């Protein structure tokens, strides 16, 4: 059991129904792969520095989880299955490194 951060960028054009659906599927995958959700930050629609799948914006989701290591990669693959999912980046969590502290 190691601590990770799942970043997920979604389609900005999603309405309530489709978005809530995508979140439910995401959390169902997080459940199915044994990942326990600690803290969640939903940032939402934000500007991008470059277009992603033709869209100038993206819908940002951030999860902090504790899951088994061996399954991690696999989980990410699953998250990429969805058509409406733009980006998935799973980062092994780390302690902050301050400058000017």
């Amino acid at each position: 059991m190691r601590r990770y951060e799942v970043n997920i960028v979604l389609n900005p054009n999603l309405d309530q129904s489709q978005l809530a659906l995508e979140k439910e599927i995401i959390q169902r995958a997080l459940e199915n792969y044994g990942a326990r959700v600690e803290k969640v930050e939903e940032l939402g629609l934000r500007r991008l520095a470059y277009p992603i799948a033709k869209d100038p914006q993206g819908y940002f989701l951030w999860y902090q989880v504790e899951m088994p290591e061996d399954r991690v990669n696999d989980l990410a693959r699953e998250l990429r299955i969805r058509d409406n999912v733009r980006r998935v980046m799973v980062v092994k969590s780390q302690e902050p490194f301050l400058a000017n502290a």
Binding site: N7, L43, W62, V91, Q94, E95, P96, F97, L98, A99, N100, A101
Partner: peptide, 15 residues
């Protein structure tokens, strides 16, 4: 660049 700036986490990609 660093001299005029506050305290910040260098490890934070989302900021």
């Amino acid at each position: 660049v660093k001299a005029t700036l506050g305290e910040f986490d260098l490890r934070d990609y989302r900021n």
